[PDB]
Design an enzyme around this catalytic site. Structure first.
Site, PDB file in Angstrom:
ATOM      1  N   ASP A 188      78.313  90.907 -55.054  1.00 38.57           N
ATOM      2  CA  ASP A 188      78.412  91.362 -53.675  1.00 38.57           C
ATOM      3  C   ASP A 188      79.753  90.950 -53.084  1.00 38.57           C
ATOM      4  OD1 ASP A 188      77.105  92.454 -51.150  1.00 38.57           O
ATOM      5  OD2 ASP A 188      77.530  90.397 -50.511  1.00 38.57           O
ATOM      6  N   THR A 192      80.170  95.732 -47.041  1.00 40.61           N
ATOM      7  CA  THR A 192      81.055  94.609 -47.330  1.00 40.61           C
ATOM      8  C   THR A 192      82.257  95.036 -48.166  1.00 40.61           C
ATOM      9  OG1 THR A 192      79.403  94.043 -49.021  1.00 40.61           O
ATOM     10  CG2 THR A 192      79.532  92.624 -47.077  1.00 40.61           C
ATOM     11  N   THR A 193      82.015  95.334 -49.438  1.00 42.85           N
ATOM     12  CA  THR A 193      83.096  95.584 -50.383  1.00 42.85           C
ATOM     13  C   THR A 193      83.895  96.825 -50.010  1.00 42.85           C
ATOM     14  OG1 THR A 193      81.357  94.932 -51.936  1.00 42.85           O
ATOM     15  CG2 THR A 193      83.560  95.287 -52.830  1.00 42.85           C
ATOM     16  N   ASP A 214      70.508  92.295 -48.366  1.00 36.89           N
ATOM     17  CA  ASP A 214      71.218  93.561 -48.251  1.00 36.89           C
ATOM     18  C   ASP A 214      70.290  94.763 -48.355  1.00 36.89           C
ATOM     19  OD1 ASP A 214      73.277  91.779 -48.228  1.00 36.89           O
ATOM     20  OD2 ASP A 214      74.360  92.623 -49.941  1.00 36.89           O
TER      21      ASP A 214
HETATM   22  N1  LIG Z   1      74.334 106.415 -57.863  1.00 35.41           N
HETATM   23  C1  LIG Z   1      75.520 106.393 -57.209  1.00 35.41           C
HETATM   24  N2  LIG Z   1      76.409 107.399 -57.346  1.00 35.41           N
HETATM   25  C2  LIG Z   1      77.593 107.398 -56.706  1.00 35.41           C
HETATM   26  N3  LIG Z   1      77.982 106.406 -55.886  1.00 35.41           N
HETATM   27  C3  LIG Z   1      77.189 105.335 -55.654  1.00 35.41           C
HETATM   28  C4  LIG Z   1      75.884 105.268 -56.320  1.00 35.41           C
HETATM   29  N4  LIG Z   1      75.312 104.117 -55.923  1.00 35.41           N
HETATM   30  C5  LIG Z   1      76.172 103.496 -55.078  1.00 35.41           C
HETATM   31  N5  LIG Z   1      77.294 104.227 -54.919  1.00 35.41           N
HETATM   32  C6  LIG Z   1      78.457 103.865 -54.070  1.00 35.41           C
HETATM   33  O1  LIG Z   1      78.799 102.485 -54.239  1.00 35.41           O
HETATM   34  C7  LIG Z   1      79.215 101.927 -52.991  1.00 35.41           C
HETATM   35  C8  LIG Z   1      78.757 100.476 -52.873  1.00 35.41           C
HETATM   36  O2  LIG Z   1      79.177  99.927 -51.629  1.00 35.41           O
HETATM   37  P1  LIG Z   1      78.834  98.396 -51.279  1.00 35.41           P
HETATM   38  O3  LIG Z   1      79.830  97.514 -51.990  1.00 35.41           O
HETATM   39  O4  LIG Z   1      77.356  98.189 -51.498  1.00 35.41           O
HETATM   40  O5  LIG Z   1      79.119  98.314 -49.698  1.00 35.41           O
HETATM   41  P2  LIG Z   1      78.790  96.963 -48.885  1.00 35.41           P
HETATM   42  O6  LIG Z   1      79.757  95.955 -49.454  1.00 35.41           O
HETATM   43  O7  LIG Z   1      79.043  97.327 -47.440  1.00 35.41           O
HETATM   44  O8  LIG Z   1      77.343  96.687 -49.214  1.00 35.41           O
HETATM   45  C9  LIG Z   1      78.637 102.815 -51.899  1.00 35.41           C
HETATM   46  O9  LIG Z   1      79.634 103.127 -50.921  1.00 35.41           O
HETATM   47  C10 LIG Z   1      78.151 104.071 -52.597  1.00 35.41           C
HETATM   48  O10 LIG Z   1      78.825 105.230 -52.098  1.00 35.41           O
END
Ligand SMILES: Nc1ncnc2c1ncn2[C@@H]1O[C@H](COP(=O)(O)OP(=O)(O)O)[C@@H](O)[C@H]1O
Ligand SMILES: Nc1ncnc2c1ncn2[C@@H]1O[C@H](COP(=O)(O)OP(=O)(O)O)[C@@H](O)[C@H]1O
Ligand SMILES: Nc1ncnc2c1ncn2[C@@H]1O[C@H](COP(=O)(O)OP(=O)(O)O)[C@@H](O)[C@H]1O
Ligand SMILES: Nc1ncnc2c1ncn2[C@@H]1O[C@H](COP(=O)(O)OP(=O)(O)O)[C@@H](O)[C@H]1O
Ligand SMILES: [Mg+2]
Ligand SMILES: [Mg+2]
Lengths: 152, 526, 202, 525, 527
Positions: free
Chosen positions: B59, B92-93, B390
């Protein structure tokens, strides 16, 4: 909910209807900057409402005082006229600093700035050039009366 | 030894291009750390703590909090991820990569003798147009449907480590928010941190983890004669002590007669029996307090068949008050019938790994629950605890704002074509920094193919051509395979509050770090 | 780390050693109490007043003539600025308060092209109009509680008509929303009755 | 690296670098802990900084008391902590699976493949390994002769098979007389006392309790037969009021009246005890024993000794729980409702002194439901061998009673599970074909280590064992005496179902998470 | 230029060491325990030499008993502590034979290195030693020739206690046998539990060992604070409370409100203490012994009614006085004593060796407790005789538990070396080599007796097997002079502690097996 803290609000208070401002920023460094910028903005409208008088900002006051004090030093100046003449050049550093930080022309924009303020004092034909300031986004002298650049 | 006539001793001064282009490289350095932790093909990052612990996570918030930096602009990016962690859950990321890319294109215009206030004034005009684009491509959500809410929380945990147990973690995080959704007066609130406690116990399997319909604590009974299994107890919550303590005064007793010393020792026993007679008038079964219980109070509750727990925490008393519907009273002689926790289900003192745990479960309508996590060790149980936090906050955003944005690259490409078509009517010097905001949004579909190993040239040329037409507009990047699949068929949907907080924080991070042209370091304070 | 651009916050945290440097640093602290935004421009003028007077005293001109020459130019500058003003707050109306607010925000982080932060400041000062004796409409700006919270963007800054207390309820059993509330303001500790030093229980 | 730019004193490991750190450290813990798996393992002498000898070979005590500073070794030690916390045995075999799940996966990841492709094969292999474990378990209705062979397997692997014949009679007979009628057996009812009397092969099973404190008065009886246990929680010693009061007297004749009056509340508690002895028909011997968890002043000890009441003091917290079940009385906290219903009964209460340290024994109860294993080891380090093996054996028979099925022994489970993954290897139909092969070869380390510690060949033994399994239907295993494949269900070598179930779950998740780690770094300074 | 060898697979220690294998762990534990066997080999037997051992506290310990030597040596080797703690368990079980454990287990590990380096590993040496150890406990009941059963008086136990005395005090074997006979038999519980705690040693500095004697009672090292030192009636009232009055426990505060309560408070305190001291003078008491302090008013009426005061600051010495005179320690202040009084014969004071002592001498009713008053020229000599006295007391406890005896002085170990060798020749297996080496470990025990006597042990050990031709079973060693010509042990009277020989073989075999089980050593960084 104030993003993972608790904040109590009182609505309109039924007696005086006061006001409070809750600022929202990205990090704690922006929130300390937004608090200082808002407190300086509250002090501007305080002095205008108390003392109902405003002057044009953006170097318009320092341009008019740079030429009136040169004529003032020539009338009653015998030995202290050199200090009044250097008082006008020291006041010119406020429109000079606006041209340096904007990366614009320095010795030409301020020279064009005092060209309008000189004609507003030696040519009494109602030129109304006492509100000539600086447009730092364009690099030309503008009228601060219509542009809305007001200072207390 | 004469002192040197200096000014501003032992401090540094730095201005010019070394601060404007110096804060960009500090922002690019943090964005390259967590760049491999965005897509579903991401990997964990093992961290080491100064206390001796180990944080093995992927994360973006938990990684940046364990990094101690010395650069001043690098300290600003860590507080950005802390803001995204408290507002939304899975935001976050994405902000740290986006703020590093919006500053990457901002460094190009600083070399073109352009003022930084021109780029920020173009960033604020671009920020106001990114909010209006997401509200046009949104979709209303039926929050009453159970299968619709499971697809939203599954899209947020596909990146995390609980994507393997996706059928179990989605049902736990959905039932945790719907239990703690309490509304007393005319104000809806969801408190998933004070009432949705996530307790982890080392041992067992992860498939046996489930959200309990009630609370649980690690506390044994005060006496072995007390019952460890009550069917329907009447729980009375206390706050004061059941002992005899010194008053808040300077009390001193002069003992001159022989019968005076034995009377005070008898009045201490009658005072405990008076407050023990005041709690049995409502006929309870379980007495729970926060302070100590003396042995004289344990004797009167033993023959009255009362199970007493001794030193339950204050945060656990506030959590059991919502589950059983009891009132935390602080005066035993002021107990009422409304302060009794009726409606509580089965109470059982189980033992999980040579340690007793008090279970208060099977309630009728609890307003606070406890997620029981059981795994291999405390290392991976801290991962599931950080992933369920989360997973419960992304369900809180839908219940307060039921709008979904097509994620997985489809959100960023739908706005990058909207900023490109709107930039044709600019006709000014702010037109070119307005175009760079649409190009800075390309780093989110860039990351989904760089993590799975796909090509970034043949895919981004085809993905940009899919958004040339106004009909489809929802084509994203599939991180599982690596091709272009529509998000209406995959089911990857992100909430509106996640995507709005991502764009509002990444722009204003670039607003703050572009107005910095000077740095003074070396002074002290109080 | 403190990111700021105001002339008072920078010079207060910056350490100085020279006695002529402490005059300009304490000059910026006086501008906050007297005026409140005038606290980068005073430091540049007061240092350039010494730079041009240094060129005079190198010409064997006595500094008392420069001190007396500056007083004839300072009193004439106040005389000229009080006879060459445009108009009071009757002709412009509310447009004078918004345009004067945007001039102060242009040097800071809240200098947007819109009028979002400008309208919240004018609506805050106009809501705390406290009258005084002999016809004095005072505007105490210290009564506006300015709170900070790392949340959404700058366009979500709420203007709470009332007061925003920065505290919690405490016990989690009280109703956190009370409509038609009656506030009881009191200052005494609601704890157990503890006797004083002169009183003892014997 | 990016971490070197922000923090110059922060070490880091890259993608191909952090994988070599975790795998080579897992081989370091594997090569050390493989010399103690099974009955043919060697004893390890562990010396701390003080100089005391900790002679043991359990996998949990080896990993904790080892001078190692490594982040990979701290992850395996936490998984090994929970294996010895909820189910006892299964700690040495826990580390050897993780040591092979990372070594067999290194043969594919270094040869071009991605680490996530191997972890997708581990989940598909765990699903077949969990279904195959439910088909090989044997339900034997928890017979008392079955629990002997379950306890004998866990005790041999920690002792030299001369005490395993003695400790099996002390573990099986202790776990049966605790709870009945499908009740969860509480392990707090068994007291473990360390003595020094005779020898290591003299550990008996006391049917009652053994208290580590004796009588605190020289006039009390040392051997009491047909006693009455009065379990108390009151404080018989002198206590003051909570409010600071003090005394005030005028003459010296009123001084002695206050000392007599300040002990009146103390002697009122003692007068309730000596009147209970007169109400239980005290025209006989009629011994009385008061365990009395809180302290007793010597004034009340002198009063109880004249009536003939043995009074102990400073008992444990769980002594009011174990003796209450053993004596059948009621642990009282006051003397307001004293009655013969709350009294206990024991046929013999005696004490014994071992180097100015008395030990109170309570025996001859009707239905105690609380026992005490009296470990009488000669040396101090030999007491740690038996205590760590008793709790390894008590948790083995506790899981065999709670779970209704028994799992077979040494090689009857791991060899049959690996052969089931070969026939289901083309069932995945994808890139994870090599992930099931890496999981099947990692389960074969349990017949490989047991053939290596016994002195036999490693590869020659695994050919003959897999030949007898493929040409028959019996779950054949490893014999640590001849090397021939022998069935474990017939020779009396069993295992627990929850140990093998968690070995397929705790080791698999901790291997799929370690293989997905590529940024080992140390920051925070 | 010069390269080096780094860590290979598991070098993760932060300053610790690691040992694995037969050469690095097993053979180094043997050579460390071999040095402890050669250390106490000189101090073994009646011709053994003393050892001046200085511990960390810079005080002198000179003795020939191997139990107190290992308590002062700060050994840091881990496997060497296993043979030290095994010898400490011999002292706690029977109290004699602690030097036998260091010789037998030191020879077991020494001959174990001659088996691992010649052949089979530790899987058969351990199983080979346990077979011969179980057979060694079967010959020991067959080697019992005499018993300490008939005529349990001071005449017969004087000769039965000579073996435990002459092994540490060779020249004083006759006088110390009589002092240990008049003390152990006099405290007999009439066929009950024999307590070794009821024999105390009062070290009095002065003349030699010929002035030592045993007094029926207790001898302290304190004063009287009075003038009633001559007591012949000896009615002792024992108190554990301080003999100074009765004060409360909570705070204690005198409250005066008028002049009548202030002036009469001093005279009222003296009349209160006078009625309590005269309450014990009417009961006939002569000696009042307290545990705590004594006020000045208590000493005023103790000398007025002529009763002697004894101050005992130790609380364990107060409990031994109650078992001496037959009294009960009263926690309360002075009552009218009904029947819990003490009864001695003569309580007096005398300055012996410039040390004023208090003697509770029992003239007629002699047997309640015993105290051996030792006289020595140095303080270090009185500690060595006290170790020899306490070995004689622990020998009397062994004869109470088991009255059987075996012929010592080397006669038992040769018969144990002959029968185990008969089991080794009839063993059809590869484990017969460890059985024959178990019998050779018994061969080194009379070898240490001959090396300390200055005799060539090869000619000594050759005559022992020559006279053990299947029917003698009693000839030991005659170490009184050179050219031995060894004789019988039942005729000379050298036989002691069959139960001491039973536990010493069992503890030393389990000590040598525990070292051989250690194959891998992981030590920590010492501090
Ligand atoms: N099955 C999938 N196919 C395409 N993109 C995905 C899939 N699962 C997650 N993602 C992408 O991965 C990203 C993960 O973001 P994340 O690091 O969780 O944000 P945060 O740090 O705010 O939690 C999301 O923006 C999403 O668009
Ligand atoms: N729109 C504008 N055009 C030209 N000049 C401006 C404009 N807005 C602000 N300024 C100038 O910027 C200066 C900012 O001064 P500032 O640093 O706020 O003074 P202080 O430090 O006393 O608050 C003012 O003197 C004003 O003339
Ligand atoms: N008598 C025996 N015969 C064959 N194998 C055995 C025997 N006893 C134990 N084992 C094997 O030794 C292995 C390890 O046992 P143990 O050391 O008790 O557990 P752990 O290694 O987890 O600490 C088990 O998997 C079991 O199959
Ligand atoms: N009179 C004697 N003649 C020959 N040998 C003797 C005589 N007295 C004692 N010994 C020998 O001296 C040895 C002393 O052993 P000792 O050090 O007392 O053993 P431990 O240390 O176990 O008490 C005995 O083994 C005994 O055989
Ligand atoms: Mg996520
Ligand atoms: Mg001896």
């Amino acid at each position: 909910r104030i993003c993972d803290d608790e904040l109590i609000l009182i609505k309109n208070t039924k007696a005086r209807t006061s006001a409070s401002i809750i600022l929202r920023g990205a990090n704690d460094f922006m929130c300390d900057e937004m608090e200082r910028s808002l407190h300086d903005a509250l002090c501007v409208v305080k002095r205008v409402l108390e003392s109902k008088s405003v002057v044009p900002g953006g170097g318009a006051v320092e341009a008019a005082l740079s030429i009136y004090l040169e004529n003032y030093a020539t009338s009653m100046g015998s030995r202290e006229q050199l200090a009044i003449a250097e008082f006008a050049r020291s006041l010119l550093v406020i429109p000079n600093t606006l041209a340096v930080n904007a990366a614009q022309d320095s010795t030409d924009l301020v020279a064009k700035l005092r060209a309008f303020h000189n004609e507003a004092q030696v040519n009494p034909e109602r030129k109304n050039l006492k509100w000539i300031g600086l447009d730092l986004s364009n690099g030309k002298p503008r009228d601060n009366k219509q542009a809305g650049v007001f200072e207390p | 030894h004469r002192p040197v006539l200096v000014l501003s001793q032992n401090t540094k001064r730095e201005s010019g291009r070394k601060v404007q282009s110096g804060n960009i490289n500090a922002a690019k350095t943090i964005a390259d750390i967590i760049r491999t932790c965005l897509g579903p093909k991401s990997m964990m990052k093992m961290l080491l703590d100064p206390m001796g612990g180990i944080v093995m996570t992927n994360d973006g918030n938990a990684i940046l909090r364990e990094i101690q930096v010395q650069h001043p602009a690098a300290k600003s990016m860590i507080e950005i991820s802390r803001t995204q962690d408290e507002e939304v859950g899975d935001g976050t990321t994405s902000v740290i990569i986006l703020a590093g890319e919006m500053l990457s294109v901002a460094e190009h215009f600083l070399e073109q003798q352009m003022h930084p206030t021109v780029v920020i004034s173009a960033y604020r005009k671009a920020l106001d147009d990114m909010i209006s684009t997401l509200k046009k491509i949104s979709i209303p959500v039926d929050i009453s449907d159970s299968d619709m809410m499971l697809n939203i929380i599954n899209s947020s945990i596909t990146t995390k480590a609980i994507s393997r147990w996706s059928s179990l973690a989605c049902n736990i995080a959905l039932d945790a928010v719907k239990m703690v959704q309490f509304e007393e007066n005319g104000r809806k609130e969801i408190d998933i941190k004070k009432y949705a406690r996530v307790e982890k116990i080392p041992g067992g399997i992860i498939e046996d983890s489930c959200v309990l319909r009630g609370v649980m604590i690690n506390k044994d009974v005060t006496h072995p004669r007390m019952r460890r299994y009550i069917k329907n107890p009447r729980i009375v919550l206390l706050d004061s002590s059941l002992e005899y303590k010194k008053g808040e005064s300077q009390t001193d007793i002069e003992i001159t007669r022989e019968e005076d010393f034995t009377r005070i020792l008898q009045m201490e026993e009658e005072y405990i029996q008076q407050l023990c007679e005041d709690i049995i008038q409502l006929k309870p079964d379980v007495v729970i307090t926060e302070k100590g219980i003396s042995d004289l109070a344990q004797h009167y509750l033993m023959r009255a068949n009362i199970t007493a727990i001794r030193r339950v925490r204050k945060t656990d008393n506030n959590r059991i008050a919502r589950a059983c519907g009891a009132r935390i009273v602080s005066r035993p002689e002021e107990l009422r019938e409304d302060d009794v926790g009726t409606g509580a289900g089965l109470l059982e003192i189980k033992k999980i790994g040579d340690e007793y745990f008090t279970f208060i479960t099977d309630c009728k309508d609890p307003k606070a629950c406890t997620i029981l996590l059981r795994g291999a060790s405390k290392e991976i149980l801290s991962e599931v605890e950080r992933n369920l936090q989360d997973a419960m906050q992304v369900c809180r955003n839908v219940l307060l704002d039921p709008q979904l944005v097509p994620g997985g690259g489809a959100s960023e490409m739908a706005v990058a074509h909207a900023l490109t078509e709107k930039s044709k009517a600019m006709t000014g010097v702010e037109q070119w920094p307005y175009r760079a905001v649409a190009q800075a949004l390309e780093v989110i579909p860039r990351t989904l193919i760089q993590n799975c190993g796909a090509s970034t040239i043949r895919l981004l040329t085809s993905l940009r051509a899919k958004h040339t037409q106004e009909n489809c507009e929802t084509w994203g990047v599939n991180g599982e395979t690596g091709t272009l699949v529509d998000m209406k068929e995959l089911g990857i949907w992100e909430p509106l509050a996640v995507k709005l907080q991502t764009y509002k924080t990444a722009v204003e991070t670039a607003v703050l770090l572009l107005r910095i042209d000077d740095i003074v370091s070396g002074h002290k304070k109080k | 780390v403190t990111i700021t651009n105001d002339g008072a916050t920078i010079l207060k945290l910056l350490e100085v050693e020279h006695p002529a440097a402490k005059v300009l640093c304490e000059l910026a602290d006086l501008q906050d109490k007297e005026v409140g935004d005038g606290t980068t421009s005073v430091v540049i003028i007061a240092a350039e007043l010494l730079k041009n007077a240094d060129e005079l005293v190198k010409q064997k001109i006595h500094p008392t003539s420069v001190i007396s020459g500056y007083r004839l130019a300072c009193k004439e500058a106040v005389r000229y600025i009080n006879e060459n003003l445009i108009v009071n707050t009757d002709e412009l109306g509310r447009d004078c308060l918004i345009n004067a607010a945007k001039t102060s925000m242009s040097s800071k982080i809240i200098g947007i092209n819109g009028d979002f932060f400008a309208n919240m400041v004018v609506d805050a000062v106009l809501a705390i109009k406290y009258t005084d004796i002999r016809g004095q409409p005072r505007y105490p700006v210290n009564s506006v509680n300015i709170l900070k919270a790392h949340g959404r963007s700058q366009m979500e800054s709420m203007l709470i008509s009332g007061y925003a207390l920065n505290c919690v309820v405490g016990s989690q059993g009280m109703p956190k929303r009370i409509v038609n509330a009656k506030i009881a303001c009191l200052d005494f500790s609601l704890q157990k009755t503890k006797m004083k030093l002169g009183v003892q229980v014997v | 690296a990016a971490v070197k730019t922000l923090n110059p004193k922060a070490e880091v490991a890259r993608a191909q670098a952090a994988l070599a750190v975790n795998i080579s450290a897992a081989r370091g813990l594997q090569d050390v802990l493989r010399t103690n798996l099974g009955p043919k393992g060697t004893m390890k002498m562990l010396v701390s900084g003080a100089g005391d000898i900790k002679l043991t070979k359990d996998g949990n005590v080896l990993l904790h008391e080892m001078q190692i500073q490594h982040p990979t070794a701290s992850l395996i030690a936490k998984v090994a902590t929970a294996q010895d916390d909820i189910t006892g045995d299964g700690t040495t075999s826990n580390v050897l699976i993780i040591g092979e799940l990372l070594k067999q996966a290194d043969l594919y990841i270094s040869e071009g493949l991605h680490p996530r492709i191997i972890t997708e094969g581990f989940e598909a292999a765990k699903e077949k390994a969990l279904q195959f474990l439910e088909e090989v378990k044997v339900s034997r209705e928890m017979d008392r002769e079955t629990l002997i062979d379950v306890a004998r397997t866990s005790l041999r692997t920690k002792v030299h098979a001369e005490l395993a014949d003695v400790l099996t009679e002390a573990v099986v007979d202790s776990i049966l007389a605790i709870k009945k009628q499908d009740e969860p057996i509480d392990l707090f009812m068994i007291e473990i006392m360390e003595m020094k009397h005779k020898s290591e092969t003299d550990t008996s099973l006391i049917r009652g309790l053994v208290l580590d404190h004796g009588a605190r008065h020289p006039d009390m009886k040392k051997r009491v037969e047909d006693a009455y246990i009065l379990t108390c929680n009151v404080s018989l010693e002198y206590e003051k009021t909570e409010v600071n009061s003090g005394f005030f007297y005028k003459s010296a004749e009123e001084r002695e009246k206050l000392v007599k009056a300040e002990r009146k509340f103390i002697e009122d508690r003692v007068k309730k005890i000596i009147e209970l002895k007169r109400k239980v028909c005290g025209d006989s011997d009629k011994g009385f024993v008061v365990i009395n968890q809180k302290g007793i002043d010597p004034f009340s000890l002198d009063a109880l000794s004249k009536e003939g009441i043995v009074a102990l003091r400073r008992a444990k917290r769980r002594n009011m729980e174990r003796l209450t079940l053993a004596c059948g009385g009621v642990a009282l906290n006051s003397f307001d409702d004293l009655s013969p219903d709350c009294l206990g009964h024991a046929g013999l209460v005696y004490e014994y002194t071992l180097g100015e340290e008395k030990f109170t024994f309570i025996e001859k109860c009707n239905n105690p439901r609380s026992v005490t294993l009296l470990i009488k080891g000669p040396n101090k380090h030999t007491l740690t061998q038996i205590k760590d093996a008793v709790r390894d054996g008590l948790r083995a028979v506790k899981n065999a009673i709670d779970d209704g099925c028994v799992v077979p022994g040494a090689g009857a489970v791991e060899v049959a599970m690996a052969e089931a993954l070969i026939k289901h290897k083309p069932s995945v139909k994808g890139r994870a074909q090599l992930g099931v092969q890496a999981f099947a070869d990692a389960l074969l380390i349990i017949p490989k280590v047991l053939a290596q510690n016994s002195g036999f060949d490693l590869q020659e033994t695994l050919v003959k064992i897999q030949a007898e399994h493929s040409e028959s239907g019996q779950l054949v295993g490893v014999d640590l005496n001849t090397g021939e494949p022998m069935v474990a269900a017939e020779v009396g070598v069993w295992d627990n179902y929850c140990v093998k179930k968690q070995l397929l779950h705790s080791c698999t998740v901790i291997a799929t998470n370690i293989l997905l780690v590529d940024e080992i770094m140390r920051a925070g300074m | 230029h010069v390269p080096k060898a780094p860590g290979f697979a598991q070098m993760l220690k932060e300053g610790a060491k690691h040992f694995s294998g037969l050469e690095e762990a097993v053979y180094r534990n043997i050579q460390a325990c071999k040095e402890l066997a050669q250390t106490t080999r000189t101090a073994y037997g009646p011709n053994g030499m003393n050892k001046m051992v200085i511990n960390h506290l810079e005080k002198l310990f000179v003795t020939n008993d191997a139990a107190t030597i290992l308590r002062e040596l700060e050994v840091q080797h881990p496997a060497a502590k296993m043979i030290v703690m095994a010898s400490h368990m011999q002292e706690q079980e029977v109290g004699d034979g602690t030097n036998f454990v260091l010789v037998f287990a030191g020879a077991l590990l020494e001959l174990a290195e001659e088996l691992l380096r010649i052949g089979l590993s530790v899987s058969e040496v351990i199983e080979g030693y346990e077979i011969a150890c179980r057979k060694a406990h079967e010959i020991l009941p067959n080697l019992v020739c005499c018993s300490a059963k008939n005529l349990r008086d001071i005449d017969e136990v004087s000769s039965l206690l000579r073996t435990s005395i002459m092994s540490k005090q060779y020249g004083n074997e006759v006088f110390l046998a009589k002092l240990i006979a008049q003390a152990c038999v006099s405290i007999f519980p009439d066929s009950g539990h024999f307590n070794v705690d009821n024999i105390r040693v009062c070290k009095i500095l002065g003349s030699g060992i010929s002035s030592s004697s045993v007094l029926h009672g207790m001898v302290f090292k304190k004063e009287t604070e009075g003038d009633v030192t001559s007591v012949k009636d000896a009615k002792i009232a024992v108190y554990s409370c301080p003999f100074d009055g009765m004060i409360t426990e909570t705070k204690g505060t005198v409250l005066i409100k008028t002049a009548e309560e202030l002036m009469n408070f001093s005279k009222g305190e003296e009349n209160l203490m006078d009625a309590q001291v005269k309450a014990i003078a009417d009961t006939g008491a002569n000696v009042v012994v307290t545990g705590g302090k004594v006020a000045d008013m208590a000493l005023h009426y103790a000398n007025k009614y002529n009763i002697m005061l004894v101050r005992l600051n130790s609380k364990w010495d107060l409990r031994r006085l109650c078992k001496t005179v037959g009294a009960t320690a009263l926690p309360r202040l002075t009552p009218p004593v009904l029947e819990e009084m003490g009864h001695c014969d003569s309580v007096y004071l005398s300055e012996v060796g410039d040390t004023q002592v208090v003697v509770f001498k029992h003239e007629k009713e002699d047997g309640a407790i015993s105290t051996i008053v030792l006289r020595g020229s140095t303080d270090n000599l009185m500690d060595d005789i006290e170790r020899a006295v306490d070995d004689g007391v622990n020998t009397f406890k062994v004869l109470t538990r088991d009255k059987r005896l075996v012929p010592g002085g080397g006669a038992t170990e040769i018969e144990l070396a002959k029968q185990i060798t008969s089991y080794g020749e009839t063993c059809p297996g590869l484990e017969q080599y460890a059985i024959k080496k178990f019998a050779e470990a018994f061969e080194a025990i009379p070898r240490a007796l001959a090396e300390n006597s200055g005799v060539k042990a090869n000619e000594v050990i050759s005559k022992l097997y020559a006279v053990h031709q299947e029917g003698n079973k009693n000839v030991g060693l005659d170490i009184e002079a050179e050219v031995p010509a060894v004789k019988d042990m039942l005729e000379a009277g050298i036989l002691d502690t069959y139960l001491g020989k039973y536990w010493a073989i069992k503890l030393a075999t389990n000590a040598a097996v525990t070292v051989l089980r250690v194959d891998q050593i992981i030590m920590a960084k010492p501090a």
